[PDB]
């Protein structure tokens, strides 16, 4: 059986729970001559996985008192009564043999809000609840527990001070929680003690603890599938990928390739997301030192092709954040009245990761800057745009939730969302020339069979105002030669490597895909501050 | 057993329920001698949590009469004739004990509109109560009181003269109106010489009848809490402050905002908009006397209308944790539904709640998404929007009571908002955030740090008088630029400094990628007013 | 351009509920 042991993980919303019940009977003495009741009645919110259900089972057997277990729906039923009298036949038995704990679960299911709902015994399942917990001389001896994961389906003359009063919240633990949950759900599996769980409490972070007990049985199955004796991190590393936590469930971003080595060239702008992302998760002591807010999310802006959504996939797979991948006007609906709770739930499900990252691709379909200067079109969806606007700064404070965008051009773009706070970082990125264009083809060749030593120079030189996506199809069409010869190894392919053979076909063939008159909209900006403006 | 001196908030609603139930029967030769036969109960209603069971509580010790409880869906039964057959064998269980008083509790589960219900056994039910009250010849003496939440959902064939006289509503306390409350609810406790109840009483607003009974419950939990390091106690004030954080919503428990504050020091520069914005709250809510000596409503609408940049969201949470009065926060759009009755519905239950919890302060960030109500049907604007805006300018002055709500709106679009909500009784309190000027550029830098060492023998005047024409939040990219190479600088191996000393060096790199958000064309359009 | 503005329910027939009158 579980008990106060198991129950670990959580401080602050644990004591509010063991004083409320086990304090008034373990010391009835202090609560006489005060004046004052003791509380007689717990709710719990929260997200859906903590465990709201699991500690009523945990002070069932601590206590020592008796206990009554009821369900949501166990009680109603058709032939009308009953569904009130099995309510009432569970509060006497719980009346007799003081003290008598009772455990009833499922509120978001049954008594709801009663007029905002159609339903004929629903009006008399919340009304009969009410005058059982605090009618004519009522509560004498039985105390009420309940856990519920929507706090606003429930009837608000329900947590009023007579039925469930102090409220508590038992929300994800971040601020050092996830690392007792691993102690706990471990002590009874056997461990090789090889490695630390410091380093791994801090890989994940949108997870709820049903979850850390779902990476640990991922662990278990991988350990008796390669051994077909204890476990290894082997083991949970492969429970750190395909995680997919029950917060996140909705959006899977686990499909792409590894990063870090094929962008090159960039230097800047890569090093840029790593001073971002990495910042507050791994040294979060560095900014309460200083007491400052940390930066915000990055934009990118520029050609076409140039490496702007594999940059984000970048911060995908490398960093130890969560991600959440929005494709372009995904999130937009056809009824009038959803067409901001997608903009709503995919940042409600931000928040309590914290923290993560998430991407917004195509941004010209997304902004739509203002709908009172376009008439010439007939927009005037200015609805989605300003729920994004009170999502990413908003009203509530912050938690460590990164927004990235890229388009192609910033001036259809809002400048109430180009401010920081929001937004703040707008780097252009540059196209290559005679510095950037050799650390590509190294880059992008990488997992690549080679020939002996050839110059790359050369393609640098010739090619002159190319883009990234332009430098693909210039080796692409080389591999695509390169098999020609294999069809030909019929009656074994003896070059398991690339020679030229292209150049001469594929390097006169110099398609590019951005004009010269569609390339001075992208030089025009020109940020007007300069340096050179300190203190003398 | 409780009393009528256990017992308060209204006054005049008590005396005619004493009136009632406790007159006719001490005193019966005023009703024979002249006029007619005196009225039975009543049905109580109002908001839940205001003394409503605890009233009829006292009338069943002080009268001394044969008293029956009687709950709503306690009496049920799966037999075709045991739904009706307990209410009608209790009804003449008190007519034989004359006289006697009836409570009938939640008569809203047996008493719903029968027009509206449609195939059930309920309707032989509330039926039965027609001919039960007040039938052929069965009402001598009894009389039956109920207490409910609910009256719209109760059929009119039951509240005549014959069965339920008056709609007593007992609603929420006012000024000197709820300190009575508080102080027969802490009596049976020991209490210190400090503390003062009239205090206690001008910072709670929407506590009505449990809600402050819960705040001396919650202030008692917190004196045992800090005693488990036989012995008597005193509460002395230091937890009436610490349960006055969280013990106000419940009604307006679905609208808690938590946990923002800036203390009314970290906003700089706007000297006098935050004496006007204060002004508007701290005069109706502390000087009550004033404003009805004069006989004038005071000013309630304030609407923000600048760039966006120069600090207007944040500055509502200014407001929400440094005055006295509640809160409801709307996050743009973040109520509007696709089922026709919700999305104008929804403005209705949140301005009556807020009209509940008097004073308060409710909030509306981003009204270009609710204000849009002369363009339609205008391609893609789509048409049958103009109902959420119609039903805003119904709960703003609309054909309701002056209960001194205010409403602050946030826009940075002043020219797409309704000019039928910008009026006077609406949105009277117009007032326009400019960029800070050089002057006001030295009070910005120190109220956003307000924690890091300054370098001492550093001066932050050269930032005020120079990157002219840039908004409050382009400032705050700066001193964030400065401390992202100030953890730079300190992330190495520190086999450097283990204090964070931010020096020149690092504000020399974050005034080259500064860029100014507002631009040159866009700010033509705030100035073309000139109001 | 057009965009629903409504679900409109305009369905659910409820619940029931018997009366068992017992036999002798
Ligand atoms: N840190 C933890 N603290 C308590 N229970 C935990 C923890 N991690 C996992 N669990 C277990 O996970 C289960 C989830 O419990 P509960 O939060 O009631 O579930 P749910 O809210 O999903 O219905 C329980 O069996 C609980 O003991
Ligand atoms: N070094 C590189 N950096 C970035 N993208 C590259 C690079 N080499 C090739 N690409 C290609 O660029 C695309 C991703 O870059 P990005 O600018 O985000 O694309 P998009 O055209 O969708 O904006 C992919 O098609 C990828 O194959
Ligand atoms: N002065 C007061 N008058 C009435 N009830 C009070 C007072 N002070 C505190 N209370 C408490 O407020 C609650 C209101 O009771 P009542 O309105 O009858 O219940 P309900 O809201 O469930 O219908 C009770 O718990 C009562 O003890
Ligand atoms: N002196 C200042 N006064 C007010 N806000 C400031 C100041 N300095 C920086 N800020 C910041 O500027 C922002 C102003 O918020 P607000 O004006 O409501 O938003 P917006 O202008 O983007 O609609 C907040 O993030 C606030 O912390
Ligand atoms: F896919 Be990119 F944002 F055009
Ligand atoms: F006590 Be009940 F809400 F009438
Ligand atoms: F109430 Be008015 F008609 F706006």
């Given at each position: 059986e579980v008990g106060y042991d198991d129950i670990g993980?959580?401080?602050?919303?644990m004591?509010?729970?063991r004083?409320?019940?086990e304090?008034?009977?373990?010391?009835?003495?202090?609560?006489?001559?005060?004046?004052?009741?003791?509380?007689?009645?717990?709710?719990?919110?929260?997200?859906?996985?903590?465990?709201?259900?699991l500690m009523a089972r945990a002070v069932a057997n601590e206590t020592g008192?008796?206990?009554?277990?009821?369900?949501?729906?166990?009680?109603?039923?058709?032939?009308?009564?009953?569904?009130?009298?099995?309510?009432?036949?569970?509060?006497?038995?719980?009346?007799?043999?003081?003290?008598?704990?009772?455990?009833?679960?499922?509120?978001?299911?049954?008594?709801?809000?009663?007029?905002?709902?159609?339903?004929?015994?629903?009006?008399?399942?919340?009304?009969?609840?009410?005058?059982?917990?605090?009618?004519?001389?009522?509560?004498?001896?039985?105390?009420?527990?309940?856990?519920?994961?929507?706090?606003?389906?429930?009837?608000?003359?329900?947590?009023?001070?007579?039925?469930?009063?102090?409220?508590?919240?038992?929300?994800?633990?971040?601020?050092?929680?996830?690392?007792?949950?691993?102690?706990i759900?471990?002590k009874?599996?056997?461990?090789?003690?090889?490695?630390?769980?410091?380093?791994?409490?801090?890989?994940?972070?949108?997870?709820?603890?049903?979850?850390?007990?779902?990476?640990?049985?991922?662990?278990?199955?991988?350990?008796?599938?390669?051994?077909?004796?204890?476990?290894?991190?082997?083991?949970?590393?492969?429970?750190?990928?395909?995680?997919?936590?029950?917060?996140?469930?909705?959006?899977?971003?686990?499909?792409?390739?590894?990063?870090?080595?094929?962008?090159?060239?960039?230097?800047?702008?890569?090093?840029?997301?790593?001073?971002?992302?990495?910042?507050?998760?791994?040294?979060?002591?560095?900014?309460?030192?200083?007491?400052?807010?940390?930066?915000?999310?990055?934009?990118?802006?520029?050609?076409?092709?140039?490496?702007?959504?594999?940059?984000?996939?970048?911060?995908?797979?490398?960093?130890?954040?969560?991600?959440?991948?929005?494709?372009?006007?995904?999130?937009?609906?056809?009824?009038?009245?959803?067409?901001?709770?997608?903009?709503?739930?995919?940042?409600?499900?931000?928040?309590?990761?914290?923290?993560?990252?998430?991407?917004?691709?195509?941004?010209?379909?997304?902004?739509?800057?203002?709908?009172?200067?376009?008439?010439?079109?007939?927009?005037?969806?200015?609805?989605?745009?300003?729920?994004?606007?009170?999502?990413?700064?908003?009203?509530?404070?912050?938690?460590?939730?990164?927004?990235?965008?890229?388009?192609?051009?910033?001036?259809?773009?809002?400048?109430?969302?180009?401010?920081?706070?929001?937004?703040?970082?707008?780097?252009?990125?540059?196209?290559?020339?005679?510095?950037?264009?050799?650390?590509?083809?190294?880059?992008?060749?990488?997992?690549?069979?080679?020939?002996?030593?050839?110059?790359?120079?050369?393609?640098?030189?010739?090619?002159?105002?190319?883009?990234?996506?332009?430098?693909?199809?210039?080796?692409?069409?080389?591999?695509?030669?390169?098999?020609?010869?294999?069809?030909?190894?019929?009656?074994?392919?003896?070059?398991?490597?690339?020679?030229?053979?292209?150049?001469?076909?594929?390097?006169?063939?110099?398609?590019?895909?951005?004009?010269?008159?569609?390339?001075?909209?992208?030089?025009?900006?020109?940020?007007?501050?300069?340096?050179?403006?300190?203190?003398? | 057993?409780?009393?009528?001196?256990?017992?308060?908030?209204?006054?005049?609603?008590?005396?005619?329920?004493?009136?009632?139930?406790?007159?006719?029967?001490?005193?019966?030769?005023?009703?024979?001698?002249?006029?007619?036969?005196?009225?039975?109960?009543?049905?109580?209603?109002?908001?839940?949590?205001?003394?409503?069971?605890?009233?009829?509580?006292?009338?069943?010790?002080?009268?001394?009469?044969?008293?029956?409880?009687?709950?709503?869906?306690?009496?049920?039964?799966?037999?075709?004739?045991?739904?009706?057959?307990?209410?009608?064998?209790?009804?003449?269980?008190?007519?034989?004990?004359?006289?006697?008083?009836?409570?009938?509790?939640?008569?809203?589960?047996?008493?719903?509109?029968?027009?509206?219900?449609?195939?059930?056994?309920?309707?032989?039910?509330?039926?039965?109560?027609?001919?039960?009250?007040?039938?052929?010849?069965?009402?001598?003496?009894?009389?039956?009181?109920?207490?409910?939440?609910?009256?719209?959902?109760?059929?009119?064939?039951?509240?005549?003269?014959?069965?339920?006289?008056?709609?007593?509503?007992?609603?929420?306390?006012?000024?000197?109106?709820?300190?009575?409350?508080?102080?027969?609810?802490?009596?049976?406790?020991?209490?210190?010489?400090?503390?003062?109840?009239?205090?206690?009483?001008?910072?709670?607003?929407?506590?009505?009848?449990?809600?402050?009974?819960?705040?001396?419950?919650?202030?008692?939990?917190?004196?045992?809490?800090?005693?488990?390091?036989?012995?008597?106690?005193?509460?002395?004030?230091?937890?009436?402050?610490?349960?006055?954080?969280?013990?106000?919503?419940?009604?307006?428990?679905?609208?808690?905002?938590?946990?923002?504050?800036?203390?009314?020091?970290?906003?700089?520069?706007?000297?006098?908009?935050?004496?006007?914005?204060?002004?508007?709250?701290?005069?109706?809510?502390?000087?009550?006397?004033?404003?009805?000596?004069?006989?004038?409503?005071?000013?309630?609408?304030?609407?923000?209308?600048?760039?966006?940049?120069?600090?207007?969201?944040?500055?509502?949470?200014?407001?929400?944790?440094?005055?006295?009065?509640?809160?409801?926060?709307?996050?743009?759009?973040?109520?509007?539904?696709?089922?026709?009755?919700?999305?104008?519905?929804?403005?209705?239950?949140?301005?009556?709640?807020?009209?509940?919890?008097?004073?308060?302060?409710?909030?509306?960030?981003?009204?270009?998404?609710?204000?849009?109500?002369?363009?339609?049907?205008?391609?893609?604007?789509?048409?049958?929007?103009?109902?959420?805006?119609?039903?805003?300018?119904?709960?703003?002055?609309?054909?309701?009571?002056?209960?001194?709500?205010?409403?602050?709106?946030?826009?940075?679009?002043?020219?797409?908002?309704?000019?039928?909500?910008?009026?006077?009784?609406?949105?009277?309190?117009?007032?326009?955030?400019?960029?800070?000027?050089?002057?006001?550029?030295?009070?910005?830098?120190?109220?956003?740090?307000?924690?890091?060492?300054?370098?001492?023998?550093?001066?932050?005047?050269?930032?005020?008088?120079?990157?002219?024409?840039?908004?409050?939040?382009?400032?705050?990219?700066?001193?964030?630029?400065?401390?992202?190479?100030?953890?730079?600088?300190?992330?190495?191996?520190?086999?450097?400094?283990?204090?964070?000393?931010?020096?020149?060096?690092?504000?020399?790199?974050?005034?080259?990628?500064?860029?100014?958000?507002?631009?040159?064309?866009?700010?033509?359009?705030?100035?073309?007013?000139?109001? | 351009?057009?965009?629903?503005?409504?679900?409109?329910?305009?369905?659910?027939?409820?619940?029931?509920?018997?009366?068992?009158?017992?036999?002798?």
């Amino acid at each position: 059986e579980v008990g106060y042991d198991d129950i670990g993980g959580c401080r602050k919303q644990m004591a509010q729970i063991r004083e409320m019940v086990e304090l008034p009977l373990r010391h009835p003495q202090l609560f006489k001559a005060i004046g004052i009741k003791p509380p007689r009645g717990v709710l719990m919110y929260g997200p859906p996985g903590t465990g709201k259900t699991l500690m009523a089972r945990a002070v069932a057997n601590e206590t020592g008192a008796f206990f009554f277990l009821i369900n949501g729906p166990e009680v109603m039923s058709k032939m009308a009564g009953e569904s009130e009298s099995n309510l009432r036949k569970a509060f006497e038995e719980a009346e007799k043999n003081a003290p008598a704990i009772i455990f009833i679960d499922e509120i978001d299911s049954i008594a709801p809000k009663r007029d905002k709902t159609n339903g004929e015994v629903e009006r008399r399942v919340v009304s009969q609840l009410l005058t059982l917990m605090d009618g004519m001389k009522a509560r004498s001896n039985v105390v009420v527990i309940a856990a519920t994961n929507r706090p606003n389906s429930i009837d608000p003359a329900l947590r009023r001070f007579g039925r469930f009063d102090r409220e508590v919240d038992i929300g994800i633990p971040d601020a050092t929680g996830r690392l007792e949950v691993l102690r706990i759900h471990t002590k009874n599996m056997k461990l090789a003690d090889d490695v630390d769980l410091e380093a791994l409490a801090a890989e994940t972070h949108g997870y709820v603890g049903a979850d850390i007990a779902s990476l640990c049985s991922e662990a278990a199955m991988q350990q008796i599938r390669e051994k077909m004796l204890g476990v290894t991190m082997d083991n949970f590393r492969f429970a750190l990928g395909n995680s997919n936590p029950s917060a996140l469930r909705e959006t899977v971003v686990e499909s792409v390739n590894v990063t870090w080595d094929d962008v090159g060239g960039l230097d800047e702008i890569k090093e840029e997301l790593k001073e971002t992302v990495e910042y507050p998760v791994l040294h979060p002591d560095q900014y309460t030192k200083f007491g400052l807010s940390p930066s915000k999310g990055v934009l990118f802006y520029g050609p076409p092709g140039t490496g702007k959504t594999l940059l984000a996939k970048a911060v995908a797979t490398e960093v130890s954040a969560n991600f959440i991948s929005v494709k372009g006007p995904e999130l937009l609906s056809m009824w009038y009245g959803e067409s901001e709770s997608n903009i709503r739930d995919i940042f409600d499900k931000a928040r309590a990761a914290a923290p993560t990252v998430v991407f917004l691709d195509e941004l010209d379909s997304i902004a739509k800057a203002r709908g009172g200067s376009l008439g010439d079109a007939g927009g005037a969806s200015d609805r989605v745009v300003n729920q994004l606007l009170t999502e990413m700064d908003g009203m509530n404070a912050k938690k460590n939730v990164f927004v990235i965008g890229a388009t192609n051009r910033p001036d259809q773009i809002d400048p109430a969302i180009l401010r920081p706070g929001r937004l703040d970082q707008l780097i252009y990125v540059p196209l290559p020339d005679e510095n950037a264009r050799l650390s590509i083809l190294n880059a992008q060749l990488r997992k690549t069979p080679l020939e002996p030593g050839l110059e790359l120079t050369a393609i640098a030189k010739a090619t002159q105002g190319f883009s990234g996506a332009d430098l693909l199809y210039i080796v692409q069409r080389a591999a695509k030669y390169a098999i020609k010869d294999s069809i030909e190894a019929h009656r074994v392919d003896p070059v398991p490597y690339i020679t030229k053979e292209h150049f001469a076909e594929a390097m006169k063939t110099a398609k590019r895909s951005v004009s010269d008159a569609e390339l001075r909209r992208y030089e025009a900006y020109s940020q007007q501050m300069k340096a050179s403006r300190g203190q003398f | 057993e409780v009393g009528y001196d256990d017992i308060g908030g209204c006054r005049k609603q008590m005396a005619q329920i004493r009136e009632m139930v406790e007159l006719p029967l001490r005193h019966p030769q005023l009703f024979k001698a002249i006029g007619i036969k005196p009225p039975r109960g009543v049905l109580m209603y109002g908001p839940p949590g205001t003394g409503k069971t605890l009233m009829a509580r006292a009338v069943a010790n002080e009268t001394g009469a044969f008293f029956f409880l009687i709950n709503g869906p306690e009496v049920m039964s799966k037999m075709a004739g045991e739904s009706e057959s307990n209410l009608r064998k209790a009804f003449e269980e008190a007519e034989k004990n004359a006289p006697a008083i009836i409570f009938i509790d939640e008569i809203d589960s047996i008493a719903p509109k029968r027009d509206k219900t449609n195939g059930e056994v309920e309707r032989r039910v509330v039926s039965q109560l027609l001919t039960l009250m007040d039938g052929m010849k069965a009402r001598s003496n009894v009389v039956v009181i109920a207490a409910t939440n609910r009256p719209n959902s109760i059929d009119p064939a039951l509240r005549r003269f014959g069965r339920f006289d008056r709609e007593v509503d007992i609603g929420i306390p006012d000024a000197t109106g709820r300190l009575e409350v508080l102080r027969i609810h802490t009596k049976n406790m020991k209490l210190a010489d400090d503390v003062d109840l009239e205090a206690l009483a001008a910072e709670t607003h929407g506590y009505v009848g449990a809600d402050i009974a819960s705040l001396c419950s919650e202030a008692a939990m917190q004196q045992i809490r800090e005693k488990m390091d036989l012995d008597s106690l005193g509460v002395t004030m230091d937890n009436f402050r610490f349960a006055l954080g969280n013990s106000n919503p419940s009604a307006l428990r679905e609208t808690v905002v938590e946990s923002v504050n800036v203390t009314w020091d970290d906003v700089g520069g706007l000297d006098e908009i935050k004496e006007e914005l204060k002004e508007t709250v701290e005069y109706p809510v502390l000087h009550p006397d004033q404003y009805t000596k004069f006989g004038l409503s005071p000013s309630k609408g304030v609407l923000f209308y600048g760039p966006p940049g120069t600090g207007k969201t944040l500055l509502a949470k200014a407001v929400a944790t440094e005055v006295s009065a509640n809160f409801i926060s709307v996050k743009g759009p973040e109520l509007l539904s696709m089922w026709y009755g919700e999305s104008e519905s929804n403005i209705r239950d949140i301005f009556d709640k807020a009209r509940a919890a008097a004073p308060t302060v409710v909030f509306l960030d981003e009204l270009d998404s609710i204000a849009k109500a002369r363009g339609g049907s205008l391609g893609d604007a789509g048409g049958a929007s103009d109902r959420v805006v119609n039903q805003l300018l119904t709960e703003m002055d609309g054909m309701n009571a002056k209960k001194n709500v205010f409403v602050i709106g946030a826009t940075n679009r002043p020219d797409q908002i309704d000019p039928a909500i910008l009026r006077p009784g609406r949105l009277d309190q117009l007032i326009y955030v400019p960029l800070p000027d050089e002057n006001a550029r030295l009070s910005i830098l120190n109220a956003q740090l307000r924690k890091t060492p300054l370098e001492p023998g550093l001066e932050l005047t050269a930032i005020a008088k120079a990157t002219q024409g840039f908004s409050g939040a382009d400032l705050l990219y700066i001193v964030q630029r400065a401390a992202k190479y100030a953890i730079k600088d300190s992330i190495e191996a520190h086999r450097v400094d283990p204090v964070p000393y931010i020096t020149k060096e690092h504000f020399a790199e974050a005034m080259k990628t500064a860029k100014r958000s507002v631009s040159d064309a866009e700010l033509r359009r705030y100035e073309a007013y000139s109001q | 351009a057009a965009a629903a503005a409504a679900a409109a329910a305009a369905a659910a027939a409820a619940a029931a509920a018997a009366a068992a009158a017992a036999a002798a």
